[PDB]
């Protein structure tokens, strides 16, 4: 057990070991706060966040854990990995604060292109890290369900990390965002479409203002569902109020991106079909040909398989949070 | 690739 020193910035508390210094307050709200801070033990700038009320409701609790597990899991160059976790509590019975430190992350997507044109091969390198990432993601039957540019971190070596796990709405597959159906892994991969085709173009690609207006914009350039997406739509509603809608030809891509990369353009039209079945998965777009100078099939990995039998458990708060101590006490830091 | 500006 480390020495722990305690301070008040922001009237909030903070408890955390000796080895994290020159904590400054960079965000809050109903999530938790957080601080950027130097970690003296790796000699690097480090994020630790307080997590808010972790154990007030079975609600709280439950997600407390699972937010634990899944950072406990990640072990990938191309998303974010959970470098500590700590409470100042020497037992279960003063349990109440959970800490988590990731790598502190200094530009966003959004943020990266606000002082700079990218290139074609910059946005081939930082599309392949994204779905080697997903590869990695989607093996472990994770969903990140909420990818956007905000939630892709990039360094100055361009260089990514998929953060945050779950204008969102600009980057939701439709069948999410109509609640059409159970989602498929597949949603990630049209986030990634979305987010390429502005990487390309400089334009948000289906920048609707409600659900309705978007769901326009997204159908006007895949076209209306056919009949045998429209089978796997389960609500009754969705199903009529689609079958409503004037039929709309798919667009074809290439009379709308002209200009760009062939082999972009291609991908793109693999990545937004619009019945999730169809999409190509992540582990396929890294074979496509637009990624020919940067993929390794032996530099590509997948991840231990993931356990959430937890999810449908029915526990007590006292007993979401035990089991959250639990995980707490048996975390083994990554190698420096 | 090989370098990028921070914003």
Same mark, same amino acid.
């Given at each position: ?7 008040? &910035? ?18 809050? @709200?109903?999530? @938790? ?99 080697? @990432? ?25 260089? &990514?990390?998929?953060?945050?796990? @779950? ?32 990487? &390309? ?97 032996? *530099?590509?990995?997948?991840? *231990? ?10 526990? &007590?708060? *006292? ?18 | ?7």
């Amino acid at each position: 057990r480390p020495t722990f020193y305690r301070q008040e &910035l922001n009237k909030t508390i903070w408890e955390v070991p000796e080895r994290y210094q020159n904590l400054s307050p960079v965000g809050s @709200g109903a999530y @938790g706060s957080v601080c950027a801070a130097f970690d003296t033990k790796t000699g690097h700038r480090v994020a630790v966040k307080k997590l808010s009320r972790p154990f007030q409701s079975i609600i709280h609790a439950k997600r407390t854990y699972r937010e634990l597990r899944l950072l406990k899991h990640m072990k990938h160059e191309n998303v974010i990995g959970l470098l500590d976790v700590f409470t100042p509590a020497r037992s279960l019975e003063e349990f109440n604060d959970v800490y988590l430190v990731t790598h502190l992350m200094g530009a966003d997507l959004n943020n990266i292109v606000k002082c700079q044109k990218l290139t074609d091969d910059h946005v081939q390198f930082l599309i392949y890290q994204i779905l080697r @990432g997903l590869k990695y993601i989607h093996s472990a039957d994770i969903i990140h369900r909420d990818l956007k540019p905000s939630n892709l971190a990039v360094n100055e070596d361009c260089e &990514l990390k998929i953060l945050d796990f @779950g204008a969102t709405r600009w980057y939701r597959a439709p069948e999410i965002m109509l609640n059409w159906m159970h989602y498929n892994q597949t949603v990630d991969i049209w986030s990634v479409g979305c987010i390429m085709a502005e990487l &390309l173009t400089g334009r948000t690609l289906f920048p609707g203002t409600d659900h309705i207006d978007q769901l326009k914009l997204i159908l006007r350039l895949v076209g209306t569902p056919g009949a045998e997406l429209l089978k796997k739509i389960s609500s009754e509603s969705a199903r009529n109020y689609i079958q409503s809608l004037a039929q709309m030809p798919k667009m074809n891509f290439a009379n709308v991106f002209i200009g760009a990369n062939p082999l972009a353009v291609d991908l793109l039209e693999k990545m937004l079909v619009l019945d999730s079945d169809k999409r190509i998965t992540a582990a396929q777009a890294l074979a496509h040909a637009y990624f020919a100078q940067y993929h390794d099939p032996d *530099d590509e990995p997948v991840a *231990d398989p993931y356990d959430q039998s937890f999810e449908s458990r029915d526990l &007590l708060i *006292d007993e979401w949070k035990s089991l959250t101590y639990d995980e707490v006490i048996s975390f083994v830091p990554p190698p420096l | 690739e090989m370098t990028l500006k921070f914003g």
